[PDB]
Amino acid sequence: TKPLDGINVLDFTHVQAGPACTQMMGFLGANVIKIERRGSGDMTRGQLQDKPNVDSLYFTMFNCNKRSIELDMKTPEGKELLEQMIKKADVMVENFGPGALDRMGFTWEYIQELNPRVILASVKGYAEGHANEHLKVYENVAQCSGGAAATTGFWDGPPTVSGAALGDSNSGMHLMIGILAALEIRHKTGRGQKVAVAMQDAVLNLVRIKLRDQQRLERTGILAEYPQAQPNFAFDRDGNPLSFDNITSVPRGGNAGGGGQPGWMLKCKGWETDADSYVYFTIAANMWPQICDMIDKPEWKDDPAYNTFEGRVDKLMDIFSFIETKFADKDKFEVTEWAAQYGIPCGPVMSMKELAHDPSLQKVGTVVEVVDEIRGNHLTVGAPFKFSGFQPEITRAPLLGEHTDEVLKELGLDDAKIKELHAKQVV
Amino acid sequence: TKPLDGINVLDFTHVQAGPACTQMMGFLGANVIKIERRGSGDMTRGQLQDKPNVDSLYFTMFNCNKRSIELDMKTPEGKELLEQMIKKADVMVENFGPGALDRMGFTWEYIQELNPRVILASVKGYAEGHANEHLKVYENVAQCSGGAAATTGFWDGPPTVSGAALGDSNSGMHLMIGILAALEIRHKTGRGQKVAVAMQDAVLNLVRIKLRDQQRLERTGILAEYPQAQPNFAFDRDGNPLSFDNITSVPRGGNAGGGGQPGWMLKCKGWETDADSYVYFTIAANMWPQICDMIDKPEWKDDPAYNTFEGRVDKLMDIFSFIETKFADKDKFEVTEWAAQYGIPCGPVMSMKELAHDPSLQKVGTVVEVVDEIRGNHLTVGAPFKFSGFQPEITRAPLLGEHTDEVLKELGLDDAKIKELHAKQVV
């Protein structure tokens, strides 16, 4: 058995955040019924298709392990169908605008009346009660709102967005925590709850380490592990020096260590013509003797200018520069294997091509080839949590309205009324 | 009632990933008993302290709602105490190196014998069975291994780490999903399971969209929404036009839209001296007329080379440069409100300074002032999921071994036994 076997999810979600949540629930066994707007469905279907009139990879990689029903929710018959489905649901998931579901005729209070056991889960841009609770928020705007853009990139460059979906997929995974937590209390109370995750808040949770830094900066005036702490190292575009003398908000640290020990992104053989020929190399305070052996600087072992974190603050970027010279004739895997001999945390920048075809990720079920006879097989990311008792079974994303009749039959409707709903264009 | 009230967590975790998980479980009501190495404890206590001999903000912001017991686990008495604690635990959480808990004397098989209901949850670098299963991984090494670094930053710069903890806290949040899922299934089976999340996999999950792009790129030879698909725009090391002709792995796209529609990071007034004076501005397809209005170019509304995503592909970066000129005399909040009265998708880069003191985030319980009478109050990030039925009650982080005797008394030990354990330096 799987964790969410027998959990019925009434899934209103579209785009990335909501759909990621419900897909992952589906991977863990949930019965996910995706309600799609009649005639068009989820906008991801037609976004950046790789083959004309075939559902895009955007759609398929976020909508496996779901069934699709088309529904016109503006009709009295549509609202009536939702009421019956709400009565069979364990969780309702949505990412409509604020109030949208109330305006559709389904307030939390009316939903509780229909089903006291149902959990209502929502993805929002900003938290309810926020000054911006009504603003529309998409991926990169959430990254900007939550502190990530401000603290990502370089001191002499702009705020920069992460390639990782810190806004969308991250909010969906956070909502899944919320939903699962609500299921856990329901075993105690026998009652459903409303749970909501704001995209700003999900981002902020991941930038907790930068709120640490903001407070440290306020309290002490310096962040010793940042490149800017090195005297005369960091400069802006115009050549003005950037030191903590005048920094009042956590700055961009380039490739600094963050919540890790100090580190940097170092070039390996081929970097000029291969964008991903780098390693991340860490200088852990308890590994200085090992590093010194590796780079043949035994004279740095007993020197206090080199052998403590504090001693290294004025020169750490120089040290990285020197270490980097040792990698000039080695590729990133050779360097990783070499550092690993020393027990030094160091690893390659994996290219997306490398990840897509990596046998290890397919062995452990993290990159999964989905069987799709209609569209052709494709890769997706599987469950990142591995369990002793089960494996997800990932099945292809649904065609638009593919399971409409199937779902209506399960609601106990006979063929006559199904015909009529189709005839009436409710479904 | 809180979701995890009554859930006893035996918490071996240290640094960031594991502690973020168990902290957040604590926020949702779990009884978290943090096992710390006698005499030193969690390394974060001493990491980048703002006051000498006071637990650092790294520690306090990841270890609220926990109690601390000191234990020498390599003593036979320590192992016995652990066996007693395992019998009262619902969840054990750890992020030691591969095999480390086995070597401590507690294989999964032994653990199941001790307590058939206990869930064992682990943070790992790479998944079990991976070719790199034995590599040491922290934050930015995981960002590199999971595809984020390769696809974050600029085409003419290096792979770039996110300021957000994509490796650590993200893996911790993923582990929380796995633990809650294991709790869900235990209600059915009456048995605990083993659950593990690899930091690589947590990262790859958030970069799902880049694996979408890798497949699109392999299937079609182009990613039309990327900066490199604008002819003669992106330039290389010597200064020649970039194109997808020679790109076989998803490249860095600077501040492009990602999972969102096309956008860019645009300077606002003061950008020269304020690193965060920017907005993110999206050119959504259907919003095009409103953008032509705001920017005062109704010519483009009907012009076929301007009013279509396909038409814009060859000069989208030229459009952004002009929209940016309209913001040069307005701050990021003035630019945002101006776009918001045309319904246009736009948001400011929020600084850590702004976010740390934002009234709205404190109102909604996302930024929380923790009352710490020992060390002085500090801010933290609260729960990013908001529930109708309860609010977290965040309480200060424990001093090292603060609750040792309290916890031993809960195990049924008497004062003579407790005194003996202290004398033997077991606790």
Side-chain angles (χ1 to χ4, degrees), chain A residues 2 58 138 140 161 163 165-166 187 196 201 206 208 215 218 256 259 343 357 363 366 379-381 386 388-389, chain B residues 58 129 136 140 152 165-166 184 188 193-194 196 201 206 208 215 218 255-256 259 282 357 366 379-381 386:
Chain A
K2 303 186 185 66
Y58 200 170
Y138 47 90
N140 287 343
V161 302
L166 300 180
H187 281 105
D201 291 4
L206 298 195
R208 181 190 294 276
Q215 294 179 85
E218 285 164 4
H357 306 290
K363 180 186 162 185
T366 293
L379 302 173
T380 194
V381 181
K386 314 307 185 177
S388 53
Chain B
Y58 202 167
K136 296 169 178 185
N140 289 339
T152 298
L166 300 189
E184 253 312 273
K188 286 137 65 157
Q193 275 191 48
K194 218 202 93 128
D201 295 1
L206 294 193
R208 182 184 296 277
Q215 293 180 90
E218 287 176 9
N255 281 318
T282 296
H357 309 294
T366 293
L379 306 172
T380 197
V381 179
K386 311 298 183 188

Side-chain angles (χ1 to χ4, degrees), chain B residues 105 123 199 269 289 298:
Chain B
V123 185
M199 299 168 77
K269 188 195 175 195

Side-chain angles (χ1 to χ4, degrees), chain B residues 348-360:
Chain B
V349 170
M350 296 296 287
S351 67
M352 293 314 305
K353 178 167 73 168
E354 288 166 322
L355 293 172
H357 309 294
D358 178 55
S360 287

Side-chain angles (χ1 to χ4, degrees), chain A residues 163-182:
Chain A
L166 300 180
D168 284 350
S169 291
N170 175 47
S171 298
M173 294 304 93
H174 276 84
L175 189 57
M176 190 168 177
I177 298 176
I179 290 165
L180 281 172

Side-chain angles (χ1 to χ4, degrees), chain B residues 60-174:
Chain B
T60 59
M61 294 178 71
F62 287 82
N63 297 277
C64 287
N65 295 55
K66 300 185 191 166
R67 291 186 294 164
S68 174
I69 179 162
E70 282 174 284
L71 205 58
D72 187 349
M73 289 161 275
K74 51 171 72 180
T75 65
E77 298 96 333
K79 291 171 161 55
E80 170 59 53
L81 284 170
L82 236 37
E83 288 176 13
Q84 294 178 62
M85 296 179 97
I86 289 166
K87 290 170 182 292
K88 311 215 302 181
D90 292 282
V91 189
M92 298 164 72
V93 192
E94 61 99 13
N95 63 274
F96 295 122
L101 191 58
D102 296 335
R103 295 191 297 267
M104 286 167 55
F106 299 90
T107 58
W108 170 231
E109 292 72 39
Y110 187 53
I111 288 171
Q112 288 177 109
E113 196 187 333
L114 290 171
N115 186 347
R117 289 177 54 78
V118 75
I119 293 162
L120 176 58
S122 303
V123 185
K124 307 173 171 285
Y126 287 90
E128 181 168 11
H130 201 292
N132 289 343
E133 179 187 340
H134 300 311
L135 296 181
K136 296 169 178 185
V137 181
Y138 304 95
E139 185 54 60
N140 289 339
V141 178
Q143 299 201 19
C144 288
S145 74
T151 59
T152 298
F154 281 78
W155 52 87
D156 60 346
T160 305
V161 305
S162 176
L166 300 189
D168 287 4
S169 285
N170 177 47
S171 299
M173 292 302 94
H174 276 81

Side-chain angles (χ1 to χ4, degrees), chain A residues 58-87:
Chain A
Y58 200 170
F59 176 82
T60 64
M61 292 175 73
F62 285 85
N63 295 278
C64 288
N65 291 55
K66 308 183 180 172
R67 288 189 289 153
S68 178
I69 179 159
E70 283 174 286
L71 197 58
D72 187 346
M73 293 176 278
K74 292 171 170 170
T75 65
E77 292 86 1
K79 298 181 200 302
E80 167 56 33
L81 282 170
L82 283 180
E83 286 186 36
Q84 299 179 252
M85 294 184 296
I86 287 166
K87 289 182 175 302

Side-chain angles (χ1 to χ4, degrees), chain A residues 207-225:
Chain A
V207 320
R208 181 190 294 276
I209 201 76
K210 307 295 174 182
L211 180 59
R212 176 203 67 171
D213 294 351
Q214 185 53 34
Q215 294 179 85
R216 289 169 56 214
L217 184 56
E218 285 164 4
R219 295 173 177 210
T220 74
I222 192 162
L223 303 171
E225 83 283 17

